[PDB]
Write a protein that binds this ligand. Structure first.
Ligand SMILES: CON(C)S(=O)(=O)c1ccccc1
Lengths: 1724, 263
């Protein structure tokens, strides 16, 4: 490690790339012979003889294939020879394979067989393929090949419903085409850049099979891409331990065994070598090596040789000639035809008076192509890329039927079209390479492919290939085409860029990772097998047999290179690599490392277009470009005419590159051949180079340069300057009309104001005014407005509204349009904020709301600017000036309350031995804050406010107030609200121990069940609740005495009124205040909070005196907090988390080497990743187990109870983790190991920051954003979560201080400093959550008119904050009139929405009254929109399935967005479940609820996190169902209401209607059901009546299991039902009909319903129903809760004398099979 | 004697390219701005130019063709002898090295209605001991056509390109200067009647305490030095609250980009 050497990589490079010839000698096949001619040599190699089969060789007919595979071989009778040798290995094993065969032997069909095996892995019994359960990658080297593969594979696999596709390259939102596709076909470079980006995505885990076609490309300068791909795949497999199949396809060339080692191919099982005899058509080869050195003579010699060779086939055989330009195709066809005319031989191609000429007569005369015009009648044709598609298909269809006699073409035909010719001539092997700047030899892949096109597979008995080259290259080509050109590795030059890609991905974090990575490269295998070829002596190898030292040196050299160019920071001692944003950009945009150093050195916020074009022209991708004298004239002409001035001289290549780019944008055609090819190369690179520049300067905040570079990207992509009419971006418009429009020299925006008539008039062309008008409004255009919401005097929240102002047309806008939002300062020089904004087609008409923060200062600056700029369209931008002239900044916040230096308060101060026993053991003194508040809380009844950081022990203050209550009366009721359920449960544990166990009071925890919670409110002296569970209770405070007689109301964490669920908390607090003011018996309020800047507003809202308002600020925290906010420059989330990996470890060792540490991470996956990473760093620090503080063997009995193996491994080394996916017992094990001091570090997810019973000395917050999968975007941690996390760094009895390291993106550092070092401003958002509360308060008759609603608002925190911060609430002033109008408008809008929903009635535009719909919404705590949807959908005959669906689509079910993978599972659920749903659209949020409900009802299985989600769904289900029951019975319908009650039953018990009523019993599987049906009836009373002898003989169960069964049978409802009709003797038509039903339960049963598959404990609910099923009418419904006995009365009107069969129904919401019916009749 | 021996061809050159390269470097001067305010005058009106808009005005200019912007401001609440420049307005204009040509119409926009016209600022190739007679004539003719321009209150700021730097001087007209300038037709460097008693220097301070802002045309840009014929003294224009584009920006010279496309 220590004595490294720095190598020269360029001296190790094979400069000839794929033309490097490693073999010293070439052995020609037998029968070859060498002939001489004037100026050239010929070498003839005869066709090979096929090997005539073998000992066990038979061609496999498709019949014998596996049956799922035969569909892929439809239309074929039998596999060929090589497929028949390969089918067992390819279709019946998962073995990695390498297949070496000559071109056209059938390698791609073997790849098809491998594809078919993978496809078979995912076939259901329904026949279809789980198309969303796998992906396959086919890597083809050339784009035309990719496209042909897409077509042919798609046709072969259509019968499977499998999509094959190529990738566009945009991937704006086009990674969607990755998820749509099962078989991705792309080039190596494309798959490389995609997997370089390596963000968290499903495609990576879906990949099961990778096919590397033409893998001998390894020998080419592009080969290192294949090596990077393979090394990355194999290391991903190591990390994931999931196996991926690798299949390599190559020509037959030496080192195929090394390629095999490189693909992890077992040579015995997976290596197959087929020599060149296995070519389908035998190949007679001719090589012509010209000795002439002079160009002028050599060119005509070549034309002569091709003429003589053509004549050997004219009339007898077709000839495909191959040329390396688009111009030289026609040029050589003309040369040949001229030589034929001069020698009168032209008649040998065209038979005199034969059929072919006839077909040639028409098309040739049509002259669709000009060169085709000159050539086609004579039998000649050319074919290249610049031609039209239909002309190419013309040439192809003519050649197929043997009509064309000589076809001159390029490599593109050889790769992209299946066109075989009997004779193939390759005219020259020189091609101009712009990347190299000179002429070079043809690539080997091109040669092999072209000569593979020689000999037609069916018609020809042999093929004839004629390669013409220079004499010195004969040995080379002879080698390549005769199995002797060895495949070497070219990657030693590319090593820095490749290593940086792995560093950016985090796969390589240090030099040992890099060495291991390089051990997977093909270069490494080649170095092992031929060291001297790679600059390693054989004694060097013997002294270093695994080449450890050599790889260390190579890695060291590359790392030094990358570090010199600032892509990486390389610590030589540790070997450690630190990623940088510049390195990330170089990798993600496929830029070489020298180019990124150049950009970093030359880019500056002051650059103009001049220096920007120059910077671009200096890219290292262009380092070989030169300015030739023959070019210098043409270039000079362009140099003084280019619109962007060029500073440097024409002598400098940078000026030529600059001018070429500008000529390209101006769409100028040039004359020099080198100039055209150089332009193509430059401008093909320009797009992604300039996007890299754009991302650089954008992330630095450089406003002007960001504008210029995004514009330059778009000018390159659209090939036009800004000045041009933006309308020419519509390629359907004529050029002459837009030339007219530019000639009229008027602002393009003016066209918006005009109609089609004026548009026709401005351009002197009326005939077009309509279409132009259309296009003017197809052009993307966005309207912007702001709402400025001040937060402090220096922080401003901005809500930007984006309204689309254009017509969407998918032919023009595709599926989405992308924009950049840029908030820029006064001078338009600093980007204060930016973000990507995607306008999806489905939302092309809606307003989009964006919100962000920006700093402001005093004196306020004139304005900011918001620009919204298209990512693709030139001249497509909207800028909104954001003036601050009328901004009303809130008041500076007041000073905090002085923390007084008081004598610490003993527990003795409680002066009650029983009270003092609560805290006597724990400590002797209360902290300074408790000391300061004690007198007010314990010795007064004043409303009190205590604001202090988390960790100040405000809970003890609430306890002081509770103990005062307990001294004032023993029957006192304290209600305690906290905003989170996990906090509520932790407090329930603590206060149960304190007040119930030690003080004999009653402590209860509300659940959600209104009956349960009302009983608890009755019992309890301490009632703990979350805000909504108390909302539903306290809504009916006028009817419930226990809500009013509250002595003490404590609300904790009240600053959370500013947060997402704050309105409910604000509402219940305001209601408690108003109740206190009404009942003339004051309810004492105690409010605990984080430090608030606007504490006085909260205190006054809750009625706290100033002397009773303790407003402390963060500095007063009893355990001092050292906070370090560390900013991270990287804008790509995964890379930034990587850059935080090591700082996490360094922070532990600096701030807390021995004391416990919590690390919060954004995601569940990150918990484990970071635990492992901390352990890896601990190990490489040779401090491997520093975080284990107990004995291993003392810990292993703990470890046995875990089911997570990696968690056990990490715990063994002293590091735990915690995420939602662990079972609660696992969480508790980890928590107690952490609190006991056993393990020192625990890594928890953000989701768990409210329910962790664990504290630490150091808290590290690793990043402050998390991915929301609903909206597919990163979301900032709410400040409230951050405060809670920081609060975990506080151990009052253990540490002298707490420490916290917040690692965040740099953009947010200052924000955190402002809102963590200072106290927090909080605001109301009740004005956005108004309706449900207005509805409730109209139902309870608190609001009876609009004035009542204004007066009610006056009780809220919202109302108080409206005068302190008017702009935040969109008020313009604070005059009493201003806020009177504002409250009136809010009231008017809310009551209008309610009345439209038919929840309330509005009479005389003043009086409001509850409708039954509103009464139901309020009774069950249902969103008024949910109840409206219900009222629409239900009517009188919808299926139980429709009930499930409408219930799933209810506002209450938009919560958990974790899963998009399980969607297909739900698809296959729809077949299993009885729910045959119409309109089977599948998505992310509410349908997850629908079929998760389905999973519950049929008792299907689910995952852990999915299970925690099921519980919430079931928490809302019963209320929604009861609302449905309540609407149906009110309307009078009898059948649908009974069906809804049975649905309540099915949800409680997790069964179905027709299912066995024995499935409610414990341990009762279907076999018990078939047994109980044999000589039995399915009833649980049946079970009860038999004696346990026969019972157990049937049930086949354990004794404890039958004890559970009997517990159920005793809790199953058994009741006495009695029906009577009062005054039945005298009934008269009209009102008086009274039915009296008496019910009596026998056993006075106690305890709740037994429903183990239902989460919350329920109480037995009953419905008494009188109706008639004949009429579908319900007359008398009453809901009942039955105790030991109860009597129910029901009223009904008797219309007329008539029929009277009446159906008394007794129905349950909890149990299936207890419904009783009694029928009778009596007339009026 | 060329005879038939020596023949060379003319490769074109163009002045605006050299000037454009030059204009790219104007940002260097913004770190080195000097006010030539060591003058005999004491108090009078005191003008405060915020540095941000002055730097921007320098960066959008040309080293040969003068450009000009209109000045708008107010007095600090309880100090009426001090005028704070709060806004510069760029209007359709074209210049030479000696003068600028602005429309007859003065800036009109509700966003300036609470402000006070304070005169104008313009760049100049070289420092000069005295105020140009072109400037005297320009300011006087603007005063005669616009009574809102008070002779005791409107000024001419010259921003002169000293080597490596910018030097500012601020002047005001005298009543004699006004009367002479409103009747002057001689555009030359020494018109008959021109006197140094026609102007006086006023006090001027650069400040970082507050920020100015810009207003620019609504339906075009401000630079017409490449579209001279499109310009007319009687042209009308509206304004918007936005920052102006540099002199050699593409929208100011569309013909260059449209005519390079013609080879
Ligand atoms: C280079 O990386 N790829 C080829 S990959 O498709 O993403 C992948 C993913 C998992 C396992 C193996 C490979």
């Amino acid at each position: 490690l220590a004595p490294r050497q720095v190598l020269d990589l360029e001296d190790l490079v094979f400069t000839q790339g794929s033309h490097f010839m490693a073999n010293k000698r070439c052995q020609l096949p037998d029968g070859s012979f060498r002939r001489q001619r004037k100026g050239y040599e010929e070498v003839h190699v005869p066709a090979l003889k096929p090997k005539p089969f073998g000992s066990e060789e038979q061609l496999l007919p498709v019949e014998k294939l596996p049956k799922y595979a035969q569909a892929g071989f439809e239309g074929f009778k039998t596999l060929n020879r090589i497929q028949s040798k390969l089918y067992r290995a390819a279709l019946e094993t998962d073995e990695n394979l390498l297949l070496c065969a000559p071109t056209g032997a059938g390698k791609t069909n073997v790849a098809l067989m491998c594809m078919l095996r993978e496809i078979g892995k995912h076939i259901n019994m329904d026949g279809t393929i789980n198309v969303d359960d796998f992906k396959i990658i086919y890597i083809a080297p050339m784009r035309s090949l990719v496209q042909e593969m897409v077509g042919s594979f798609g046709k072969r696999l259509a019968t499977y419903g499998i999509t094959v596709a190529e990738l566009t390259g945009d991937h704006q939102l086009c990674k969607e085409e990755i998820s749509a596709t099962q078989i991705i076909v792309c080039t190596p470079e494309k798959w490389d850049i995609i997997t370089r980006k390596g963000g968290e995505r499903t495609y990576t885990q879906l990949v099961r099979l990778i096919i590397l076609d033409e893998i001998h490309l390894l020998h080419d300068d592009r080969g290192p891409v294949l090596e990077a791909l393979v090394a990355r795949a194999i290391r991903n497999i190591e990390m994931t331990q999931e196996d991926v199949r690798l299949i390599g396809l190559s020509a037959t060339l030496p080192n195929y065994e090394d390629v095999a080692t490189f693909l992890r191919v077992d040579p015995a099982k997976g290596l197959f070598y087929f020599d060149n005899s296995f070519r389908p058509v035998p190949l007679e080869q001719t090589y012509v090596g010209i000795t002439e050195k002079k160009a002028i003579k050599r060119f005509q010699i070549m034309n002569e040789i091709v003429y003589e060779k053509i004549m050997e086939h004219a009339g007898k055989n077709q000839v495909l000639v191959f040329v390396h330009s688009r111009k030289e195709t026609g040029k050589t066809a003309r040369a040949i035809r001229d030589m034929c005319l001069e020698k009168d031989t032209l008649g040998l191609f065209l038979r005199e008076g034969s059929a072919s000429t006839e077909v040639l007569r028409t098309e040739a005369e049509q002259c669709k192509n000009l060169e085709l015009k000159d050539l086609l009648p004579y039998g000649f044709a050319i074919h290249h890329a610049g031609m039209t598609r239909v002309d190419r298909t013309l040439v192809e269809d003519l050649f197929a039927d043997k009509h064309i006699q000589v076809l001159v073409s390029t490599a593109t035909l050889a790769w992209g079209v299946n066109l075989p010719a009997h004779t193939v001539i390759i005219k020259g092997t020189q091609v101009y390479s712009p990347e190299k700047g000179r002429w070079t030899e043809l690539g080997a892949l091109d040669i092999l492919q072209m000569l593979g096109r020689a000999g037609r597979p069916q018609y020809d008995t042999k093929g004839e290939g004629i390669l013409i080259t220079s004499h010195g290259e004969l040995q080379y080509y002879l080698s390549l085409l005769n199995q002797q050109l060895p495949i070497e590795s070219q990657m030693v030059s590319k090593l820095p860029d490749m290593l940086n890609a792995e560093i950016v991905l985090g796969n390589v974090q240090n030099a040992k990772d890099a060495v291991n990575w390089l051990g997977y490269a093909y270069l490494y295998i080649r170095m092992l097998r031929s060291p001297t070829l790679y600059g390693i002596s054989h004694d060097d190898l013997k002294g270093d047999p695994l080449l450890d030292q050599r790889r260390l040196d190579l890695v060291h050299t590359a790392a030094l290179m990358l570090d010199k160019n600032n892509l990486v920071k390389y610590d030589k001692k540790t070997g450690n690599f630190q990623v940088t944003e510049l390195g990330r950009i170089a990798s993600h945009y496929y830029i070489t490392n020298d180019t990124v150093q150049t950009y970093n050195q030359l880019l500056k916020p002051t650059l103009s277009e001049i220096e920007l074009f120059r910077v671009f022209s200096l890219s290292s991708e262009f380092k070989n470009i030169t300015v030739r004298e023959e070019e210098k004239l043409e270039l000079q002409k362009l140099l003084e005419r280019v619109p962007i001035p060029v500073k440097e001289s024409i002598e400098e290549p940078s000026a030529k590159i600059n001018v070429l780019l500008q000529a390209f944008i101006s769409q100028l055609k040039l004359e020099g051949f080198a100039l055209m090819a150089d332009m193509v190369y430059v401008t093909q690179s320009a797009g992604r180079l300039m996007r890299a520049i754009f991302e650089i300067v954008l992330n630095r905040g450089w406003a002007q340069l960001t504008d210029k570079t995004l514009n330059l990207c778009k000018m390159i992509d659209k090939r036009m300057w800004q000045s041009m009419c933006p309308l020419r971006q519509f390629r359907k418009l004529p050029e002459e009309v837009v030339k007219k429009i530019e000639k009229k020299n008027f602002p393009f925006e003016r066209l918006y104001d005009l109609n089609h008539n004026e548009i026709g008039e401005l351009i002197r062309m009326p005939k077009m005014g309509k279409t132009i008008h259309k296009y003017v409004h197809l052009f993307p255009k966005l309207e912007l407005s702001v709402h400025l919401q001040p937060i402090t005097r220096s922080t401003l929240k901005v809500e930007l509204t984006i309204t689309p102002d254009f017509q969407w047309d998918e032919k023009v806008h595709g599926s989405s349009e992308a924009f950049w939002i840029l908030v820029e300062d006064v001078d338009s020089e600093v980007i204060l904020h930016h973000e990507y904004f995607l306008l999806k087609a489905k939302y092309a008409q809606d307003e989009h709301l964006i919100t962000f923060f920006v700093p402001v200062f005093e004196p306020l600056p004139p304005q900011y600017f918001i620009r919204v700029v298209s990512d693709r369209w030139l001249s497509c931008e909207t800028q909104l000036p954001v003036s601050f002239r009328h901004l009303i900044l809130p008041e500076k916040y007041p000073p905090p309350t002085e923390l007084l230096d008081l004598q610490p308060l003993p527990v003795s101060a409680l002066r009650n031995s029983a009270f003092e026993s609560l805290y006597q053991d724990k400590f002797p003194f209360f902290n300074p804050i408790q000391t300061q508040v004690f007198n007010t809380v314990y010795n007064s009844d004043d409303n009190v406010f205590v604001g202090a950081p988390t960790g100040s022990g405000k809970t003890i203050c609430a306890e002081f107030a509770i103990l005062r209550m307990l001294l004032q009366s023993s029957e006192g009721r304290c209600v305690y609200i906290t905003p989170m359920e996990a906090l509520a449960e932790q407090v329930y544990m603590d206060w149960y121990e304190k007040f119930q166990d030690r003080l004999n009071k009653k402590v209860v925890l509300l659940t959600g069940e209104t009956s349960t919670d009302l009983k608890l409110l009755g019992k309890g002296n301490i009632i703990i609740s979350t805000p909504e569970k108390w909302d539903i209770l306290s809504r009916r405070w006028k009817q419930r005495k226990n809500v009013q007689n509250i002595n003490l109301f404590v609300v904790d964490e009240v600053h959370l009124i500013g947060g997402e669920n704050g309105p409910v908390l604000e509402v219940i607090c305001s209601r408690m205040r108003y109740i206190s003011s009404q009942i003339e018996r004051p309810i004492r309020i105690v409010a605990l909070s984080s430090s608030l800047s606007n504490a006085k507003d909260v205190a006054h809202w809750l009625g706290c005196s100033a002397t009773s308002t303790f407003n402390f600020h963060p500095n007063v925290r009893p355990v001092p907090l050292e906070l370090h906010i560390q900013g991270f420059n990287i804008s790509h989330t995964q890379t930034r988390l990587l850059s935080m990996a090591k700082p996490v470890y360094h922070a532990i060792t600096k701030h807390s080497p021995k004391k416990p540490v919590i690390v919060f991470v954004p995601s569940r996956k990150q918990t484990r990743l970071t635990a492992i990473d901390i352990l890896t760093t601990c190990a490489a620090d040779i401090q491997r187990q520093r975080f284990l503080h107990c004995t291993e063997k003392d810990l292993i009995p703990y470890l046995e109870k875990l089911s997570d193996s990696t968690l056990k491994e990490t715990l063994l080394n002293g590091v735990g983790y915690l995420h939602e996916g662990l079972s609660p017992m696992e969480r508790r094990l980890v928590e107690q190991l952490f609190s006991s001091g056993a393990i020192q570090v625990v890594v928890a997810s953000r989701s768990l920051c409210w329910g962790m019973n664990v504290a630490a000395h150091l808290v590290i917050i690793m990043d402050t954003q998390y991915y929301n999968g609903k909206i597919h975007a990163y979301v900032d941690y709410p400040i409230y979560d951050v405060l809670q996390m920081v609060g975990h760094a506080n151990r009052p009895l253990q540490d002298d201080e707490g420490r916290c390291v917040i690692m965040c993106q740099g953009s947010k550092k200052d924000f955190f400093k402002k809102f963590l070092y200072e106290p927090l401003p909080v605001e109301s958002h009740l004005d956005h959550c108004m309706h449900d509360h207005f509805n409730a308060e109209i139902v309870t008759k608190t609001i009876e008119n609009k004035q009542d609603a204004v007066d009610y608002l006056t009780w809220t925190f919202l109302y108080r904050r409206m005068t302190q911060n008017p702009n935040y609430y969109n008020l313009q002033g604070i005059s009493h009139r201003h806020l009177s109008d504002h409250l009136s408008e809010l009231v008017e809008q809310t009551l209008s929405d309610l009345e439209q929903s038919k929840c309330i009635s509005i009479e005389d535009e003043m009086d409001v009254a509850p409708l039954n719909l509103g009464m139901i919404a309020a009774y069950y705590y249902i969103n008024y929109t949910t109840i409206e949807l219900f009222s629409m959908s239900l009517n009188a005959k919808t299926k139980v399935r429709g009930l499930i669906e409408i219930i799933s689509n209810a506002a209450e079910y938009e919560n958990i967005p974790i899963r998009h993978h399980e969607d297909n599972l739900l698809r296959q659920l729809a077949q299993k479940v009885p729910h045959k749903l119409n309109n089977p659209k599948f998505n992310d949020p509410h349908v997850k609820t629908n079929l998760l409900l389905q999973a519950h009802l049929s008792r299907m299985q689910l995952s852990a996190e999915l299970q925690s989600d099921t519980e919430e769904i079931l928490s809302k289900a019963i209320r929604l169902i009861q609302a449905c029951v309540d609407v149906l019975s009110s309307n009078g319908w009898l059948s649908p209401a009974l069906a809804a009650m049975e649905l309540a039953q099915m949800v409680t018990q997790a069964m179905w209607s027709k299912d066995s009523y024995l499935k409610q019993l414990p341990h009762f599987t279907s076999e018990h059901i078939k047994r109980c049906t044999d000589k039995g009836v399915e009833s649980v009373f049946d079970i009860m009546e038999m004696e346990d002898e026969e019972r157990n003989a049937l049930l086949q169960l354990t004794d404890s299991q039958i004890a559970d069964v009997a517990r159920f049978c005793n809790r199953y409802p058994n009741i006495e039902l009695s029906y009577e009709v009062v005054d039945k003797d005298s009934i008269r038509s009209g009102g008086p009909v009274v039915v009296l039903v008496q019910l009596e339960r026998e056993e006075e049963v106690t305890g709740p319903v037994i429903a183990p598959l239902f989460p919350q404990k329920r109480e037995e609910g009953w419905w008494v129903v009188i109706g008639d099923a004949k009429s579908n009418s319900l007359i008398s419904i009453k809901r009942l809760t039955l105790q030991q006995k109860a009597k129910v009365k029901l009223d009904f009107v008797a219309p007329a004398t008539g029929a009277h069969n009446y159906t008394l129904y007794f129905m349950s919401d909890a149990y299936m099979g207890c419904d009783q019916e009694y029928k009778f009749s009596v007339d009026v | 004697g060329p005879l038939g021996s020596m023949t060379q061809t003319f490769s074109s050159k163009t002045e605006w390219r050299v000037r454009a390269i030059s204009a790219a470097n104007l940002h260097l001067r913004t770190n080195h701005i000097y006010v030539s305010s060591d003058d005999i005058k004491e108090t009078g009106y005191t003008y405060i130019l915020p540095k941000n808009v002055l730097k921007k005005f320098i960066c959008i200019s040309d080293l040969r063709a003068q450009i000009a912007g209109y000045l708008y401001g107010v007095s600090p609440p309880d100090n009426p002898q001090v005028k704070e420049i709060r806004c510069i307005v760029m209007v359709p204009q074209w210049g030479t090295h000696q003068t600028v040509h602005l429309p007859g119409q003065l800036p009109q926009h509700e966003y300036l209605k609470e402000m006070e016209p304070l005169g104008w600022i313009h760049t100049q190739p070289n420092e000069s001991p005295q105020l140009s007679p072109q400037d005297v004539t320009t300011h006087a003719k603007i005063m005669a056509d616009n009574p809102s321009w008070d002779g005791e209150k409107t000024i001419i700021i010259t921003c002169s390109f000293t080597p490596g730097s910018c030097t500012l001087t601020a002047y005001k007209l005298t009543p004699s200067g006004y009367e002479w300038g409103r009747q002057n037709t001689d555009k030359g460097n020494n018109p008959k009647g021109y006197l140094p008693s026609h102007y006086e220097r006023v006090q001027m301070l650069l400040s970082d305490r507050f920020l100015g802002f810009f207003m620019v045309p609504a339906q075009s840009s401000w630079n017409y030095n490449f579209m001279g014929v499109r310009h007319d003294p009687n042209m009308k224009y509206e304004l918007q609250l936005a920052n102006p584009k540099e002199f050699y920006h593409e929208v100011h010279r569309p013909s260059h980009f449209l005519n390079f496309a013609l080879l």
